[PDB]
A paper describes a structure:
High expression of PSMαs, which are four peptides of about 20-residues in length, increases virulence potential of methicillin-resistant S. aureus (MRSA). Amyloid aggregation plays roles in PSM activities in S. aureus. In the present study, we investigated the structure-function relationships of PSMαs and their short truncations.
To obtain atomic-level insights into the architecture of PSMα1 and PSMα4 fibrils, we computationally identified their amyloidogenic spine segments, and determined their high-resolution structures by means of X-ray microcrystallography. Segments PSMα1-IIKVIK and PSMα4-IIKIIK, both of which are conserved within naturally occurring PSM truncations, adopt the canonical cross-β fibril architecture, wherein pairs of β-sheets tightly mate through a dry interface, forming a steric zipper. Both structures belong to the class 1 of steric zippers, indicating that parallel β-sheets mate face-to-face in the fibrils formed by the PSMα1-IIKVIK and PSMα4-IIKIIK segments. Proline substitutions in these spine regions abolished fibril formation of the full-length PSMα1 and PSMα4. Structural indicators of fibril stability of the IIKVIK and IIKIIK segments, i.e., buried surface area and shape complementarity between sheets, calculated from the crystal structures, resemble those of eukaryotic steric-zipper structures. The contrasting levels of stability of PSMα3-LFKFFK and PSMα4-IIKIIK fibrils, inferred from structural analyses, were verified experimentally. Specifically, PSMα3-LFKFFK fibrils dissolve upon heating to 50 °C, and reform upon cooling, whereas PSMα4-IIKIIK fibrils remain stable. While PSMα3 forms cross-α fibrils and enhances toxicity against human cells, PSMα1 and PSMα4 form cross-β fibrils which likely play a role in stabilizing the biofilm matrix. The highly stable steric zipper structures, forming the spines of the cross-β fibrils, putatively serve as the building block cementing the biofilm and creating the rigidity that can explain the resistance of amyloid-containing biofilms. The atomic structures of the PSMα1 and PSMα4 derivatives offer templates for the design of anti-biofilm compounds.
Numbering used by the authors:
A (entry chain B), B (entry chain B), C (entry chain A), D (entry chain A), E (entry chain A), F (entry chain A), ...: 1 to 6
């Protein structure tokens, strides 16, 4: 699981 | 699962 | 600015 | 600006 | 601006 | 601007 | 599953 | 499943 | 600015 | 500025 | 500025 | 599990 | 400035 | 588990 | 400035 | 487990 | 377990 | 266990 907010 | 907000 | 990942 | 990933 | 992914 | 993916 | 908001 | 909002 | 990852 | 990772 | 990791 | 807020 | 790691 | 706030 | 690690 | 606030 | 606040 | 506040 990969969750990113840029 | 990959979730990205740019 | 609101950014949300559930 | 509102960005949401469920 | 509203962007939503369910 | 409203963009929605169910 | 890949979900992206740009 | 791939869901993208640009 | 609000950024949240659940 | 608020940034939260649960 | 508030940054929290649970 | 990888969760990143930039 | 508040930074918390639980 | 890797959680990062930048 | 408040920094806390539990 | 790695948790970082920068 | 590694927890860092910079 | 390594906990660092810089």
């Amino acid at each position: 699981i990969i969750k990113i907010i840029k």
